[PDB]
CSV table of N, CA and C in Angstrom, one decimal:
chain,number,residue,atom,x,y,z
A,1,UNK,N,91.1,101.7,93.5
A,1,UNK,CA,91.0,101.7,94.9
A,1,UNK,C,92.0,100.8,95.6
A,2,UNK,N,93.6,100.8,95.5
A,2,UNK,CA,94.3,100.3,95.4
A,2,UNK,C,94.8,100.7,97.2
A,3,UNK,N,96.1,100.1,98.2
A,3,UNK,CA,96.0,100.5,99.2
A,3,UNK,C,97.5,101.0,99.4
A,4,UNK,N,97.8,101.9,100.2
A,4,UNK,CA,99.2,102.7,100.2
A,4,UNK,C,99.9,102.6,101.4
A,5,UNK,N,101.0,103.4,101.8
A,5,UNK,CA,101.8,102.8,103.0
A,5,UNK,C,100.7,103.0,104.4
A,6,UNK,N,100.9,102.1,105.3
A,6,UNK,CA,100.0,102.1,106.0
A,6,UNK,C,98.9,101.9,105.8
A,7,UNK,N,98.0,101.7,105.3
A,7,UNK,CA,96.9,101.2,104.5
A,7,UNK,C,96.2,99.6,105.3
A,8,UNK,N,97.4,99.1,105.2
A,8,UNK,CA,96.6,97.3,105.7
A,8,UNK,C,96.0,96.9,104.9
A,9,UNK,N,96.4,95.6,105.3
A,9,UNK,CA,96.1,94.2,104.0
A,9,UNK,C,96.4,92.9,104.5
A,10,UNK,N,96.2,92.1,103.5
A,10,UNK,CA,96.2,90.2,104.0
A,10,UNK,C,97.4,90.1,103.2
A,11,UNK,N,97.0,89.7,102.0
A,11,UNK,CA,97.9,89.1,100.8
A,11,UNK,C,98.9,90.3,100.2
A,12,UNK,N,100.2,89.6,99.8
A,12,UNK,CA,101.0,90.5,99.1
A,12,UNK,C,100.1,91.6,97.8
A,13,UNK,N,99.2,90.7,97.4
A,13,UNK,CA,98.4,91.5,96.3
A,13,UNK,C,96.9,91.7,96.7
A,14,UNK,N,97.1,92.9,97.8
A,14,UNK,CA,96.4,93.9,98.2
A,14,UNK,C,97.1,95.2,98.5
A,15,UNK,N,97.3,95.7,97.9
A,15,UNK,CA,98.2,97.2,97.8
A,15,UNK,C,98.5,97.2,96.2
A,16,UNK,N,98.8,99.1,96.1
A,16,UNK,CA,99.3,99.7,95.1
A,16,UNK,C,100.6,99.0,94.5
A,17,UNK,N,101.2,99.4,92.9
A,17,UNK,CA,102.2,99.6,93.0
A,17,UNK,C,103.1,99.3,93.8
A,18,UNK,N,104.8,99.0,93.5
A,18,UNK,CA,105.7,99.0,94.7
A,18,UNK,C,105.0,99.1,96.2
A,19,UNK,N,104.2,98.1,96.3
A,19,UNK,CA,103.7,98.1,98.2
A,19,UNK,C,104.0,96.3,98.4
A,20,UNK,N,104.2,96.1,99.4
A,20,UNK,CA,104.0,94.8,99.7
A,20,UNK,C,103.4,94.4,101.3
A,21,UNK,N,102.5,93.8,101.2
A,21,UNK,CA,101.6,93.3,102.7
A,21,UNK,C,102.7,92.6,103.3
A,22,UNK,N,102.9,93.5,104.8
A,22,UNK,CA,103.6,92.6,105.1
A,22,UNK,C,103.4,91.2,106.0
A,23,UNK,N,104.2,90.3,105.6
A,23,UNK,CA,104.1,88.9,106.2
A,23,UNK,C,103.6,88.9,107.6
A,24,UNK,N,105.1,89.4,108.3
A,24,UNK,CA,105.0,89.4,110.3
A,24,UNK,C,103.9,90.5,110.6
A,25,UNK,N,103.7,91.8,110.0
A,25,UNK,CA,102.9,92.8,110.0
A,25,UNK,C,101.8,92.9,109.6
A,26,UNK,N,101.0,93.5,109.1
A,26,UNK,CA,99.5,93.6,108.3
A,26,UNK,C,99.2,94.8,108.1
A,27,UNK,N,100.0,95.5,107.1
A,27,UNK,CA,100.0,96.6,106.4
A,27,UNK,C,100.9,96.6,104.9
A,28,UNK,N,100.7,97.4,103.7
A,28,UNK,CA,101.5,97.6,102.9
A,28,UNK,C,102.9,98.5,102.8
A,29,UNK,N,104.1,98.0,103.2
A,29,UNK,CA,105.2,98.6,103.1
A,29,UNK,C,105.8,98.8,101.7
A,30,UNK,N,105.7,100.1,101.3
A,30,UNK,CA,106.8,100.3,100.1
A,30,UNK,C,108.0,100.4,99.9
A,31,UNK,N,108.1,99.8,99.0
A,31,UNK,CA,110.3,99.4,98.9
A,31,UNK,C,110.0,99.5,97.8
A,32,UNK,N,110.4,100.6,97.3
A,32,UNK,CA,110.7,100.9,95.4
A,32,UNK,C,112.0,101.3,95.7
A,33,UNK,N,112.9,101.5,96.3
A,33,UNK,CA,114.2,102.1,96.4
A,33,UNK,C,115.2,101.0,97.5
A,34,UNK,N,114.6,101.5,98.8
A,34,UNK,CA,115.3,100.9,100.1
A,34,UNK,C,116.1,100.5,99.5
């Protein structure tokens, strides 16, 4: 039950895979590529 783009979160480790919570924002952004 992991969380995906758009999803929302606190901590960097709250999301799937390649996601990262963002700092200024409060959702998981994926960057496996960008």
């Amino acid at each position: 039950e992991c969380r995906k783009m758009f999803g929302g979160c606190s901590v960097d480790s709250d999301c799937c895979a390649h996601l990262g919570c963002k700092p200024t924002l409060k959702y998981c952004a994926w960057d496996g590529t960008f």
